[PDB]
Write a protein that binds this ligand. Structure first.
Ligand SMILES: *[C@@H]1O[C@H](CO)[C@@H](O)[C@H](O)[C@H]1NC(C)=O
Ligand SMILES: *[C@@H]1O[C@H](CO)[C@@H](O)[C@H](O)[C@H]1NC(C)=O
Ligand SMILES: *[C@H]1O[C@H](CO)[C@@H](O)[C@H](O)[C@H]1NC(C)=O
Length: 250
């Protein structure tokens, strides 16, 4: 056999978090018979199970490693290639750290338009973010970002959380006009839109059953004429508006 006196190439992250998985790769060439060599990979007191891949008088051993709280601190990663009574070994360090997630603390996750909202992180003066919730905030996300120093390397970790804002049903004269005057047989598009979260259910009825074709283009007919009661209700309340359609002679 032939096992040159040089350490195997060892690739691994110099840093690894608790309860996460890592990947080590050891390789070496110029040895023979590679198929008979024993590859010893291990981090600390944990012996790894590598997947050895052979090549032109060479090999590459890949292995995954999982760490826990007990392994916290500096651990030793080793790769040893053995043939006969000779062995080539490489020593490296891997630091296991614990970085608690910076949780986003929302006073109240779901709130109604107008309420005061406070945002703080929890994992020198204490800072919080205050803002008066607006409807434009429904679905928006607040974040808590943090950094940690481990082995001269800067690790980043964050957390985002969405805020649900609720805004009562609304029917401004602007987005749902109180009256219409259309010439019989003209083309129009009845306009009446409710506003709110949750999205309010809208119904514009005349004589309690005849609906106004809102949002769509229609041909004005005699039977559109009348008074409609547009109701927009949701768990946040209910708003009623009366709409009058006049249908002039063509
Ligand atoms: C061994 O090396 C020679 C030179 O590249 C090549 O002809 C042969 O295919 C190689 N076998 C491998 C890649 O294992
Ligand atoms: C938080 O980290 C994620 C990676 O999971 C990244 O995509 C995002 O930009 C970060 N958010 C911020 C800017 O706090
Ligand atoms: C290695 O050492 C063992 C133990 O004495 C010996 O029996 C074996 O022949 C040696 N093989 C070599 C030269 O690597």
């Amino acid at each position: 056999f032939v096992l040159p006196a040089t350490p195997p190439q060892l690739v691994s992250p110099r840093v690894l978090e608790v309860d996460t998985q890592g990947t080590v790769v050891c390789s070496l060439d110029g040895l023979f018979p590679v198929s008979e060599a024993q590859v010893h990979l291990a981090l600390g007191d944990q012996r790894l199970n590598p997947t050895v891949t052979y090549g032109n008088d060479s090999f590459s051993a890949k292995a995954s490693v999982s760490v826990t709280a007990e392994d916290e601190g500096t651990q030793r990663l080793t790769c040893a290639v053995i043939l006969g009574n000779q062995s080539q070994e490489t020593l490296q360090t891997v630091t296991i750290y614990s970085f608690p997630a910076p949780n986003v603390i929302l006073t109240k996750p779901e709130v109604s338009e107008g309420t005061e909202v406070t945002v703080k992180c929890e994992a020198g003066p204490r800072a919080q973010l205050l803002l008066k919730a607006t409807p434009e905030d429904n679905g928006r996300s607040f974040s808590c970002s943090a950094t940690l120093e481990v082995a001269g390397q800067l690790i980043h970790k964050n957390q985002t959380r969405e805020l649900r804002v609720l805004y009562g049903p609304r029917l401004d004269e602007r987005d749902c006009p109180g009256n219409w005057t259309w010439p019989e047989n003209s083309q129009q598009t009845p306009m009446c839109q409710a506003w709110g979260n949750p999205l309010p259910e809208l119904k514009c009825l005349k004589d309690g059953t005849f609906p106004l074709p809102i949002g769509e283009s229609v041909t004005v007919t005699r039977d559109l004429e009348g008074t409609y009661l547009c109701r927009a209700r949701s768990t946040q309340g209910e708003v009623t508006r009366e709409v009058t359609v006049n249908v002039l002679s063509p």
